[PDB]
């Protein structure tokens with residue numbers, strides 16, 4: 018598996034990223050806080066999004082054009098995608114009242130950090146553009162990349178807004194939890210930046226900036242991102258917490274989860290009341306009653322059937338829209354999420 022091999026060489030390159038970013042002695046203490054933010058928050062995940070930049074790059078560029086510099090730009094931009102992710106996560110864990118992330122306590126829960134994490138998160142964002150300028154400003158794709166990262170921020174932040182507006186704290190919400198609202202939320206908050214962004218960045222770096230091709234790519238990747246978020250929702254409640262590295266909050270947080278959307282579609286009137294009285298509250302007793310209703314409605318089996326139908330669907334889409342890009346570009350990614 019192309020992702021599996023590249024992982025260590027990609028992780029290995031992180032020391033250089035920090036080196037170039039953490040280097041005006043007056044702001045010395047600030048750069049030391051930045052490194053500390055980077056070490057804690059950019060490391061520990063699976064790196065699928067940044068690896069996608071490196072894997073798609075190798076697969077799109079002609080070997081005779083994969084020199085040292087060209088390859089260094091590729092994994093620098095992969096690390097830019099990782100930085101964007103770290104930024105999103107640090108801020109989202111505050112807003113979601115999360116406890117752990119990637120197998121350690123959330124950055125904003127660390128004694129001595131707190132709501133300072135808000136500035137820490139935005140520093141991670143700033144680092145993307147620091148890196149693009151340091152390594153890509155003389156490439157013809159400089160502006161394309163800047164605009165693509167900026168639009169991705171906007172996209173996810175618009176998605177996050179939908180997320181929060183559909184999960185008002187303290188408000189029985191069930192009427193809002195529809196398939197159509199769910200699909201919108203995750204298209205913007207997850208699918209664009211987790212799937213379109215890294216393939217698109219690699220495309221631009223390869224000189225593939227045709228609109229039709231990006232649209233065809235996008236068509237594949239947004240549907241992959243939709244399943245990816247549905248899987249995240251499933252894992253929030255039903256995943257092994259020692260594998261996911263994070264504790265679920267969706268029920269307590271009144272989130273428009275794929276699970277609750279599927280519950281409302283299958284719930285008897287009597288079961289709908291169970292949901293209405295227990296969802297979106299902090300009481301452990303009430304959360305557990307939601308989980309029992311899901312398991313009683315066999316949502317774990319409904320997720321299982323959905324993952325296989327969705328897989329076949331993405332596969333159909335790759336056959337439709339991959340050309341002229343190599344199929345492996347999307348099969349590598351799809352293999353890593355299914």
Ligand SMILES: CCCCCCOc1ccnc(NC(P(=O)(O)O)P(=O)(O)O)c1
Nearest residue numbers: 105106108109113173174177206207249
């Ligand atoms: C200014 C930045 C606003 C924060 C943006 C956060 O964006 C996202 C996008 C996609 N996923 C997440 N986190 C996901 P999780 O917390 O890792 O499970 P969630 O959506 O289920 O909460 C978070």
Ligand SMILES: [Mg+2]
Nearest residue numbers: 109110113180
């Ligand atoms: Mg969230």
Ligand SMILES: [Mg+2]
Nearest residue numbers: 109110113115
């Ligand atoms: Mg969250």
Ligand SMILES: [Mg+2]
Nearest residue numbers: 249250253267
């Ligand atoms: Mg989640």
